[PDB]
Each structure stands twice: as structure tokens, then as C-alpha cells.
């Protein structure tokens, strides 16, 4: 049963879902709906939102209608996809130099599941930076 991914439209909106949501890892996805990557990042998303429920709330951010925060991300590429937990900008290591966001899309829908654990967990325990248990793609 496909699920439909909420959809923040301007600052405001992506500022409340930070504040709002507690408990659980926010993920940001920015990127344009329309643009291929991000299309198979969203069925990712899309197909693991429901089995995450339980630690991680989804929404999908256009970087054209919100660039104050595209610009604070210090986005360039698209999809860029960042992490918060209670208010707090969750930094992952993946590989690269920018822990600041994942960008790109994810090898399998495993992949997108198993980063949010490390994710949840991480945080859960109390921690700011965790390291990626995948690869990117």
C-alpha cells in the first residue's frame, strides 16, 4: 500500500516540522519531485516511510521554493537529504568530507533503512554524529 510523503512547501513549514517532531529522525529530502535521481530516492522513501514509522518521519522539501534553508544546507547538488532529531542537525560520516547531508540516492531500500537506524539509535543514545553503515550509489 504506496504512501504519499508529506510535502513541507516554504520556511516556515519546514521550521515547524523541526520543532514539531519529537523522538523520531527527521529526514529532509531536497530536491524537485519532477527530477529523475530524486524520483528513485522517493520510491525509496516512499516504499520504507510505513516500516519506519516507528523512528523516522519523512518529507519531501523543494529546493527552489525554500532556498533560505537549501542555501543554509549550503545545498548544490539534488536530491540532498538531511537529518535532525529533536531539533538537532544529525551529522553522519558516510565517507566524504560533508557530514552535513547525504546526497544522492540510496543502492537499495535496505541501505536508506539500515543508515536510519544507526541514525535513530545513535541519537537515541544521546550522540550528534554517527557513522554510515552503508555506502552511497
Same mark, same amino acid.
Given at each position: 500500500?504506496?504512501?504519499? #510523503?508529506?510535502? #513541507?512547501?516554504?520556511?516556515? %513549514? ?8 519529537? %523522538?523520531?529522525? #527527521?529526514?529532509?529530502?531536497? &530536491? $524537485?519531485? %519532477?527530477? @529523475?535521481?530524486?524520483? !528513485?530516492? +522517493? +520510491?525509496? #522513501? =516512499? ?12 518529507? *519531501? ?9 537549501? !542555501?543554509?544546507?549550503?545545498? =548544490?547538488? /539534488? @536530491? ?6 529533536? &531539533? ?6 558516510? &565517507? ?7 546526497? &544522492? =540516492?540510496?543502492?537499495?531500500? !535496505?541501505?536508506?533503512?539500515? *543508515? /536510519? %537506524?544507526?541514525?535513530? $539509535?545513535?541519537?537515541? $543514545?544521546?550522540?550528534? /554524529? ?5 555506502? @552511497?550509489?
Amino acid at each position: 500500500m504506496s504512501f504519499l #510523503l508529506p510535502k #513541507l512547501t516554504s520556511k516556515k %513549514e519546514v521550521d515547524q516540522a523541526i520543532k514539531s517532531t519529537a %523522538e523520531k529522525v #527527521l529526514v529532509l529530502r531536497f &530536491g $524537485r519531485d %519532477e527530477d @529523475p535521481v530524486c524520483l !528513485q530516492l +522517493d +520510491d525509496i #522513501l =516512499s516504499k520504507t516511510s510505513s516500516d519506519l514509522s516507528k523512528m523516522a518521519a519523512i518529507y *519531501l522539501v523543494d529546493v527552489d521554493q525554500t532556498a533560505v534553508y537549501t !542555501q543554509y544546507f549550503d545545498i =548544490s547538488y /539534488i @536530491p540532498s537529504t538531511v537529518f535532525f532529531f529533536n &531539533g538537532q542537525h544529525m551529522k553522519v560520516d558516510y &565517507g566524504s568530507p560533508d557530514h552535513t547531508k547525504f546526497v &544522492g =540516492s540510496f543502492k537499495t531500500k !535496505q541501505d536508506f533503512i539500515d *543508515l /536510519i %537506524e544507526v541514525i535513530y $539509535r545513535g541519537a537515541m $543514545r544521546g550522540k550528534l /554524529i554517527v557513522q554510515s553503515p552503508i555506502d @552511497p550509489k
